[PDB]
Design a binder for this molecule. Structure first.
Ligand SMILES: NC(=O)c1ccc[n+]([C@@H]2O[C@H](COP(=O)([O-])OP(=O)(O)OC[C@H]3O[C@@H](n4cnc5c(N)ncnc54)[C@H](O)[C@@H]3O)[C@@H](O)[C@H]2O)c1
Ligand SMILES: N=c1c2ncn3c2ncn1[C@@H]1O[C@H](COP(=O)(O)OP(=O)(O)OC[C@H]2O[C@@H]3[C@H](O)[C@@H]2O)[C@@H](O)[C@H]1O
Lengths: 253, 253
């Protein structure tokens, strides 16, 4: 494990960008004003010719400004600890939007990149363990992405959490949700709908109305939002049951 | 009576190629030897500067010879009628490979294009509907696509079909599957396993052992493959029930 940057970053970013422009999410999400080139100048300038750890929460502000899309009322989803589950359920924009569906999220998803001072101004060979930079440098991209996404959310929002992780509560201030989403939700949000995942054949850790979720309910209420919570709603249980068919909580009548 | 084609077709095609090339199906599918630019050559030369209907089964043969990646033993799936449920089940290469997960597939999926013979060799305004073009010109691309895909399979293959369509038999000789995939399976293939879909709260139309599935079962046995069949296997079913959780077919116990 040495962190390997994405080869041909500009070309890959440009590809993804053009592809999304013309063919992805057309009626689910609006297009952005900026061409794929300017977005690049914007994304490049933020990290290039600077040291890997030489970045703040303001670095990519210009990019995120060009790249923000109006988000559909009531359809915005945040997730913690449940990447595969939340994304199957959200269903590629069809049921809910996730960051990964937005242009910015789509473009940069799974990509690895960093600066250097020497020409060319980005490092194509190696990249530092993120644990070695200042948090605001290491969070500077996806933190600002979350912030900007949460800011744009209107209506009901939905949040999917993991209620079975004995080592990690369903809700925590130190997650990205906790740090960058929940506190950035505007007064154009009305209700927070929490979906709690209860892993098949695993012990239930976080019940709804107790521990960290109650903690969360208090915060939601404090922000003058409406709040509700569900544990394993049907629609979701079945997604679950598909990968673990012979599972107990999937006994068909 | 006529359809609009995909804007900036080459940008889309290349962009896609580079995103596939660098970032998609890495642990799952291998890369091709050709530069993106070369894939764009064999491909454009097929339909370019011709009547929109001047296409046949061989037109794109070089493109499909180029874009052709070996396929992993046993993970290869065909479908007819059941698109979303098939790609849902397959799970973006995790459980099965679809034609759409492959380089040629990925690239052109959903795209609309057509030659004209005047500059620039393609029409950017308008293009023919389905029935408007002859059978071999309508099926030149996706049929040749299906051809190689099939030619390349090994071990167990998998066929998912619609068993609830009064208008269209689960199996057909004149489907893309029956015209192009089936005839081109090789002695390296050993078994064809069918999945019959039975849409929820809809009336069963076809069953294993019968109708076109029996026709099919014989055709298999005659090319010397083992055969197998199942109707709404639990794993499949649960996906279906996630969209219609209220349906009788999946009352929990
Ligand atoms: N798509 C992304 O690259 C990305 C990653 C994390 C979070 N987010 C945003 O914030 C929320 C999810 O993150 P969270 O912290 O609340 O829960 P989280 O703790 O589950 O986020 C971690 C998950 O995101 C990816 N990831 C792993 N390590 C990461 C790292 N250190 N930095 C960023 N992502 C990492 C993995 O899929 C991982 O399982 C979502 O609502 C989303 O909007 C986006
Ligand atoms: N890639 C396509 C494709 N792309 C668009 N379409 C495709 N059909 C088949 N294929 C391929 O042949 C098989 C399905 O063909 P067919 O049984 O005719 O699909 P069907 O379910 O009969 O085809 C459904 C519709 O989708 C169109 C068809 O022209 C038709 O308009 C698949 O395994 C796939 O490999």
């Amino acid at each position: 494990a040495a962190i390997v940057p994405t080869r041909e970053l500009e070309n890959v970013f440009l590809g993804r960008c053009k592809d999304y422009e013309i063919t992805r999410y057309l009626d689910i999400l609006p297009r952005v004003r900026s061409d794929c080139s300017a977005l690049w100048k914007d994304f490049f300038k933020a990290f290039s010719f600077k040291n890997p750890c030489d970045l703040d929460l303001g670095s990519y502000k210009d990019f995120f400004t060009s790249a923000q899309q109006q988000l559909p009322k009531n359809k915005v989803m945040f997730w913690s600890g449940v990447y595969d589950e939340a994304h199957d359920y959200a269903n590629t924009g069809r049921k809910y939007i996730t960051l990964e569906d937005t242009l910015p999220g789509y473009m940069l998803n799974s990509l690895v990149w960093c600066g250097q001072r020497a020409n060319p101004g980005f490092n194509e060979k190696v990249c530092p363990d993120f644990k070695t930079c200042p948090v605001q440098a290491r969070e500077s991209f996806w933190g600002m992405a979350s912030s900007s996404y949460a800011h744009s959310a209107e209506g009901e929002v939905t949040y999917m959490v993991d209620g079975s992780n004995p080592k990690v509560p369903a809700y925590r201030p130190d997650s990205f949700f906790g740090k960058y989403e929940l506190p950035n939700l505007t007064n154009k949000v009305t209700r927070v709908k929490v979906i709690v995942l209860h892993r098949l054949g695993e012990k239930i850790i976080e019940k709804c109305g107790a521990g960290s979720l109650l903690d969360l309910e208090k915060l939601v209420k404090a922000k003058h939002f409406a709040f509700d919570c569900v544990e394993n709603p049907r629609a979701v249980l079945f997604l679950l049951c598909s990968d673990n068919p012979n599972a107990r909580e999937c006994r068909l009548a």
